[PDB]
Specification:
330 residues, binds zinc ion, binds 3-isobutyl-1-methylxanthine, binds magnesium ion, homotetramer, 3',5'-cyclic-AMP phosphodiesterase 4D (chain A), protein-inhibitor complex, mainly alpha, hydrolase, inhibitor selectivity, Catalytic domain of cyclic nucleotide phosphodiesterase 4b2b
Chain lengths: 330, 334, 334, 327
């Protein structure tokens, strides 16, 4: 945008880039459906990643638009807006006090890049649906973390398009390390890995060693990646912790995507997946259940790790939790 | 969706619309809305039944429906022109062209099957951007197909690959001979939809019109495979370029869609600092002029030659084309 | 249609050898020669007939043979160890392990089919280099599989993909539930052959041995999918690492082959200026020492645990392993 | 070093037609493709011209050579080395002095190097008949040729393998198109049209102020490069008899293996692939009479008289096989 209105409104919104509760939907509209491109770019300047890793601006914008282009516009929930949100949320979690000066620039880059591509080329249906229809993607990945593996493959592969290699100036050592962290992070986003991820996180909280700086102590890759994996995982499962105004938009979108999968399964004569049958759904009830058995249990543990950094996030969560609970019909 | 084995009110209305399946000018857009965005599946199913293809090739009905929905699911809902509605249109248009009097009893069931299947998969998984855009961005699709008929090769590969999903092999009961023949014809047909082949296709079509030969029943005579497939390639190519030959109401809807798709590519090209492709600049475009040029240089030359081949069965179609051409002519702002 | 699945005038001598298909120590190399380098095809064919799997799963014989030939053709003839002979060996070995008294009537026909098929495809299209080599060169394969169990994921993909070639779907008559169950078990088994999972597999095998339960019949009790697939994973893993437990004559040919393959990789890593992988440096090698070490830290701890699970069915296999270990120890140049 | 001397000794003929490519294979430890490419790249100063780091070049050459099947009797790294070296000699022909740019030269050499990479040792039809994944991906059209290209370019993406990293975008785009055009033209299904176009060019042949071929447009320039590499690919019968017979034995061994596999599967056995009903000699004479001679004869015209000796050797070899045809 130039010295006009359309710009001011966008730039004014990008001002909240470092705050939980960013009006990502507003930005999506204002940026002409380029929330991932503008939010990623802003965060990259904000963290001075272009300079640090010598990323030509044009290569970065080209890769970003390409990546965003590979998110499906026709998918209600798993699209570029969700990706921008997970990225922005991770960017905020990276700045939590308890993690001050803990992670390197490269590790920061990995968490942000991973967030950016963690759902690219999502068809809007689950792994199980792809497995049951014997999709080519499922045959390729042996029914294991099919989509997650695919998100990774596409994210890296897009680096190869014209003027898209944003890591062209990283040394071989940086590339090997970045790639491994990105893979470890994205694969951890598969919900089939939630429980174990949460378990290890709790075990870590029970070993919580703070440094002379009062900041978490991570002296090995295993601990370092585990925090990064859970961070991005919390960001991916953070809709319930956002201002009700946003949380509600996310809920309607996920439900629309689920119901759409349900209709496809109904068409094909397949068994309709949980929460995907629009004729017998409990949106309000499912949200409460989602928060009770997964979101709240996860964020609570995370709050313990960075205590008291995420205290406000939890309150918002428990609050939103009540809101939906009180909307449950009778 | 029905109630106690009876059609729903919507299914009934859908059925009444499908009554014009054998007519040029079907309200394909209404069919799309009434079918819940399943124009390709219903039109294909209607056509297979009408032509008794399920029995002839022993295609179980469940398998056909499953493959149809799967094929339709792979057309992009976010692509304004090259989507399932366009596929359904090319299918129904080819279906009407196959029934032309001049081609009565000319083709076998397998050739008919091939022309129809080819029409159904001809643009599957179209990304909404041209081959050149895929080539210039060094997409993996262009790498895989060596920048040659990139999209056309991809449509074919996807069309056939989907037969491998659960209960999707509609050709499971065909012998190897039928399958190799079917496959060869379908591949020959779809690759012929690449506009870069237009001129040579048209050159060949004319050659045939020059040496055209009618049989005992005033029907076209096509010996060798070269001439039979050539006619099928041109038939599906005509169908793919039939929007301007349709009643103005339908034609204008197609024009809005292709222009919307073109402008989106232009916008992406501009964002990327790439040269903007012809007719893709929403800031510097002449929709009317382009449609006039499109008809004069490509569509009319092709259809006039086809009208000649099946003379005089395509007379009305040609008259409608010329009328739409003049209409756009008088709209060009001066 | 031939007797053993492949034409051969030495068929008589092939029959003599194949009579030992149920025996530990089959002359797989001799069978490879007599069958015309078709060890995997004839041995698999023989086992399927013997176990009556063609009848049970309604597998047409021509389809089974076509798939087997296709699968075998996809093992590299230029790879000294991870080839069709190793595949045939693992299959036959798994076949014997499945027949151990302690497991009589424990596994279903579907589970048996999974273990055998998994063994057959577990190394298909192996390039003769390790996962790290594929990862360090940024190969397309490692890119696709995100550096995780690259080869193993590939073996599975190819194994299932080949079912799509002409007349190769040996599972065409299985119900959808049988296919999904089979598919899941096969994947679970092949992914477990990744040596990076050896320790965790063994640790679990030991825990099972500690909590070992038997039925009224003196047969292993396996209550849940978890314990079932675990025994099958370790079973195939044992067969894959069974060379040191075979008659010295056979064991030595396997050692010569794996060493040749390792050195082959070492020369490639040397040319490329890469760090040479362990045991892959022909200039600094201790073949004998390495075998003894392999037995002491990997092979014996695994087989001792397996022997305890099916005690005393594998006592002779364990005794041979120890006889062979001593042999290599006595050949270490001092 | 003892053999390093023999290698360098043999490599002195890299500019000569009839190089003992088989000996180079042995002396180099089966690295003919890599060594010959390296020599030619230095010989033509290509590393400097395009700023190709030596380490990157050799890594890619080894990687490309590794993707040639060592189990395949004919379409392997030895055949690729041979086609590259032959293309190298043809490019140096007097009638073409200073005609082609270093990018066009690079294109022809590169294309020759990758033109058969990852060849399975069976024909396109075999792949099509078995519904192989490759045929499904390429819609039964130039299946293998398309694949050779795809692999050739994909391998540039491996660790330190991008030999074109320092070419401008303009050069990369131009090179890619030329390489694709050249390799796709090695598909025998394109033979007749290529020849027809080469003959036409010979009819309307024009030369510059220096007497070298006058190639005015891309269409004409690429057509000459396509046919050059095509001639290099079909140059076995033009080499001295001793090498030629070694190649015939290799191709027949590959064909027979395919025939054995087709018979095992109950498939129709492809022409010349039935070891129980073969006519090696007859096939070579027919191959020369209907394809190799018509092609080389027209090329000889185009570069007259540069290829006279090559054509004479070809005709002699043909007479030789003729005399071995039974009955
Ligand atoms: C994996 C899935 C069960 C987790 N899950 C869920 O249950 N509901 C209801 C959601 O809305 C949702 N959004 C993301 N993940 C979600
Ligand atoms: C550019 C290509 C899609 C061909 N083409 C075209 O040029 N114009 C103007 C159209 O309206 C059109 N509609 C379909 N194809 C079209
Ligand atoms: C680590 C192991 C799986 C690979 N490995 C090995 O190291 N040695 C020494 C062998 O003899 C051997 N035989 C098969 N695999 C082997
Ligand atoms: C027909 C052709 C494509 C295959 N073909 C052949 O038939 N003969 C006799 C050869 O010597 C030969 N050399 C390469 N290709 C060959
Ligand atoms: Mg996800
Ligand atoms: Mg098209
Ligand atoms: Mg293995
Ligand atoms: Mg070739
Ligand atoms: Zn997500
Ligand atoms: Zn179309
Ligand atoms: Zn193995
Ligand atoms: Zn060749």
């Amino acid at each position: 945008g130039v010295k006009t209105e359309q710009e001011d409104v966008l730039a004014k919104e990008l001002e909240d880039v470092n705050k939980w509760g960013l009006h990502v939907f507003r930005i999506a509209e204002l940026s002409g459906n380029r929330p991932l491109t503008v939010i990623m770019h802003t965060i990259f300047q904000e963290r001075d990643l272009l300079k640090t890793f010598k990323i030509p601006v044009d290569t970065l914008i080209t890769y970003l638009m390409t990546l965003e282009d590979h998110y499906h516009a026709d998918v209600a929930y798993h699209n570029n807006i969700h990706a921008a949100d997970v990225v922005q949320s991770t960017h905020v979690l990276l700045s939590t006090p308890a993690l001050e000066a803990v992670f390197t620039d490269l590790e920061i880059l990995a968490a942000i890049f991973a967030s950016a591509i963690h759902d690219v080329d999502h068809p809007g249906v689950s792994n199980q649906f792809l497995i049951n229809t014997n999709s080519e993607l499922a045959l390729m990945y042996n029914d294991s973390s099919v989509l997650e593996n695919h998100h990774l493959a596409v994210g890296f592969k897009l680096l190869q398009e014209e003027n898209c290699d944003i890591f062209q100036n990283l040394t071989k050592k940086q590339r090997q390390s970045l790639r491994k962290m990105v893979i470890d992070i994205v694969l951890a986003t598969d919900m089939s890995k939630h429980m174990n991820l949460l378990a290890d996180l709790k075990t870590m909280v029970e070993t919580k060693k703070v440094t002379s700086s009062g900041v978490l102590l991570l002296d090995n890759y295993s601990d370092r990646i585990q925090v990064l994996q859970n961070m991005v995982h919390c960001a991916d499962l953070s809709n319930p912790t956002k201002p009700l105004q946003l949380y509600r938009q996310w809920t309607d979108r996920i439900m629309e995507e689920f119901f759409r999968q349900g209709d496809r399964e109904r068409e094909r004569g397949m068994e309709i997946s949980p929460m995907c049958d629009k004729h017998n759904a409990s949106v309000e009830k499912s949200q409460v259940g989602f928060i009770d058995y997964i979101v709240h249990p996860l964020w609570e543990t995370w709050a313990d790790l960075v205590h008291p950094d995420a205290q406000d996030i939890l309150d918002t969560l428990e609050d939103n939790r009540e809101w939906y609970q009180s909307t449950i019909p009778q």
